A paper describes a structure:
One such position was residue 26, located in the loop connecting α1 and β2. This residue belongs to the central CORE domain (residues 1–30, 60–126, and 164–217), which are known to be important for the overall structural stability of AKs. Mesophilic AKm contains Ile26 at this position, and its side chain is in close proximity (<5 Å) to other hydrophobic CORE residues, including Met1, Leu3, Val21, Tyr24, and Leu82. Notably, a thermally stable AK homologue from a thermophilic bacterium Geobacillus stearothermophilus also has an Ile residue at this position,26 supporting that Ile26 is important for optimal hydrophobic CORE packing and thermal stabilization of AKm. Mutation of Ile26 in the mesophilic AKm to Thr (as found in psychrophilic AKp) resulted in a 7.0 °C reduction in Tm. The I26T mutation in AKm significantly reduced catalytic activities at high temperatures (55 and 65 °C), whereas the activities at low temperatures (5 °C to 45 °C) were similar between the WT and mutant enzymes. In contrast, in the crystal structure of the AKm I26T mutant, the polar side chain of the mutated Thr26 residue cannot have these hydrophobic contacts with other non-polar residues in the CORE domain. Consistently, the I26T substitution reduced the apolar buried surface area in AKm.
Adenylate kinase (AK) is a phosphotransferase enzyme catalyzing interconversion between ATP/AMP and two ADPs and is inhibited by P1,P5-di(adenosine 5′)-pentaphosphate (Ap5A), which mimics two adenylate substrates. Structural studies have revealed three characteristic AK domains, namely, the CORE, AMPbind, and LID domains. In the present study, a structural comparison of AKp and AKm revealed suboptimal hydrophobic packing in the CORE domain of the psychrophilic homologue, where a polar side chain makes contact with hydrophobic neighboring residues. We also determined the crystal structures of two AK mutants, which showed the largest thermal stability transition compared to wild-type (WT) AKs.
Numbering used by the authors: 1 to 212
Write the structure that this text describes.
């Protein structure tokens, strides 16, 4: 399966993406994760992206498309992929169509995890991420079994730098503006499927599993 996840900041892409990869083993490709790994490693690209990321702005298309094209050519994607948070502009989506023609792997589904804008700030400010594997928890909605550490590997959980009220507020503004153009682009292609992202995690995943 060649899958794309989309959704507003905090809508549950990672949470659902993780269950999809567990069940089907498709490599989980998150542009956010990739940029954060570059920033952790202090690579030139990391340092370039950081300026945009710290603001809640989109990293420019050209560099973003370039890291996805390079990633999608790697040998681990031949048995399929799960793309997460790319594309998030029509121009990214067009370039993806071209990239996927080129790698002989057309999109099976675009899954939009639809969540109400007003509930996203509380999802993000309460989010805690594992410093080792990057799985997400929430202090209320999805707590770890042991406070402060990952269930899977005991890594310390932390608050992402961009999960502050100020930066979230910009991330929502920025991505909301791109949302309908992107949903139009993909409903027009016939790949789009919508899921109600405002249910218990397992119930959102039940609905995802049905689509696949
Ligand atoms: N293509 C691109 N072009 C340009 N720039 C790009 C780019 N891709 C990335 N970037 C740059 O990188 C930045 C970061 O991008 P990115 O990391 O992709 O951030 P995002 O798209 O804002 O999504 P998040 O990872 O914050 O949320 P998610 O939807 O994965 O939610 P999660 O499952 O964690 O869940 C959220 C929380 O809610 C909880 N939760 C999950 N599901 C539920 C549920 N059903 N009910 C209640 N709580 C839930 C979780 O426990 C968690 O705490 C961008 O802002 C931009 O600067
Ligand atoms: Ca380095
Ligand atoms: Ca609303
Ligand atoms: Mg994520
Ligand atoms: Zn972990």
């Amino acid at each position: 399966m060649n899958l794309v996840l989309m959704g507003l900041p905090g809508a549950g892409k990672g949470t659902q993406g993780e269950r999809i990869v567990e069940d089907y083993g498709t490599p989980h490709i998150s542009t956010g994760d990739m940029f954060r790994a570059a920033m952790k490693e202090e690579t030139p690209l990391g340092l370039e992206a950081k300026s945009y990321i710290d603001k809640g702005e989109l990293v420019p298309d050209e560099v973003t498309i370039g890291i996805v094209k390079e990633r999608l050519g790697k040998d681990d994607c031949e048995r399929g992929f799960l793309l997460d948070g790319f594309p998030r502009t029509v121009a990214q989506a067009e370039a993806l169509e071209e990239i996927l023609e080129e790698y002989g792997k057309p999109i099976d589904y675009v899954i939009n995890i639809e969540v109400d804008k007003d509930v996203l700030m509380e999802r993000l400010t309460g989010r805690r991420i594992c410093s080792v594997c990057g799985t997400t928890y929430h202090l209320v909605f999805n707590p770890p079994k042991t406070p402060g550490i990952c269930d899977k590997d005991g890594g310390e959980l932390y608050q992402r730098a961009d999960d502050n009220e100020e930066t979230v507020s910009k991330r929502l503004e920025v991505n909301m503006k791109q949302t309908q153009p992107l949903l139009d682009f993909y409903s027009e292609k016939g790949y789009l499927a919508n899921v109600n992202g405002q249910q218990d995690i397992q119930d959102v995943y039940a609905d995802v599993k049905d689509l696949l």
